[PDB]
Amino acid sequence: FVNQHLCGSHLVEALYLVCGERGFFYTPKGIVEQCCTSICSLYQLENYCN
Amino acid sequence: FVNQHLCGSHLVEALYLVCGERGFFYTPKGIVEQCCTSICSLYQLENYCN
Ligand SMILES: [Zn+2]
Numbered sequence A, B: 001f002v003n004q005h006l007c008g009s010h011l012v013e014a015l016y017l018v019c020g021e022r023g024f025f026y027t028p029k030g031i032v033e034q035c036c037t038s039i040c041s042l043y044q045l046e047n048y049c050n
């Protein structure tokens, strides 16, 4: 996985790819303050699939 | 397979800009049958925001 800062529509694109079929929930808040202002791993990103 | 997959990618991105700060919930069921085969405006997409 790209060990990078995922911000704006780049964050919803990743979530989209990782969560596949499941779907996901996007909430400008804790996913932000850490996957954007910080770096997240496949792992951490998967906390947002439905 | 291909088709709806490509299409949802285009939708999450449209729901990012529309929804803004209320975020959203993406579920490949409801949405894609509605908006992949026919055009769906920004107007129509806010159905889908939180
Ligand atoms: Zn960009």
Ligand SMILES: [Zn+2]
Binding pocket: B006, B010
């Ligand atoms: Zn495309």
